[PDB]
């Protein structure tokens, strides 16, 4: 019923967290301030630079209404 079908692939790096939703860039590259990527009790991975500046604004996770804490 088929002899030569094939599709187009698209591969990521098997990273559970897609992007740093502070600078809206990837996690692999450096931060806008600069590198170092932090984690939280809400299981969200953003840059240490993106988070240390965030806690000056508010100590709340940007995605869910939860108080941010370090890991």
């Amino acid at each position: 019923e088929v002899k030569k079908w094939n599709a187009v692939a698209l591969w990521a790096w098997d990273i559970v967290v897609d992007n740093c939703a502070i600078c809206r860039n990837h996690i692999m590259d450096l931060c806008i301030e600069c590198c170092t990527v932090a984690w939280g009790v809400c299981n969200h991975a953003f840059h240490f630079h993106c988070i240390s500046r965030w806690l000056k604004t508010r100590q709340v996770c940007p995605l869910d209404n939860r108080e941010w804490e370090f890991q």
Binding site: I27, M28, T36
Partner: peptide
């Protein structure tokens, strides 16, 4: 730094 230079790890 596992996700800073992950390709190197990979």
């Amino acid at each position: 730094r596992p996700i800073s230079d992950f390709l190197t790890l990979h």
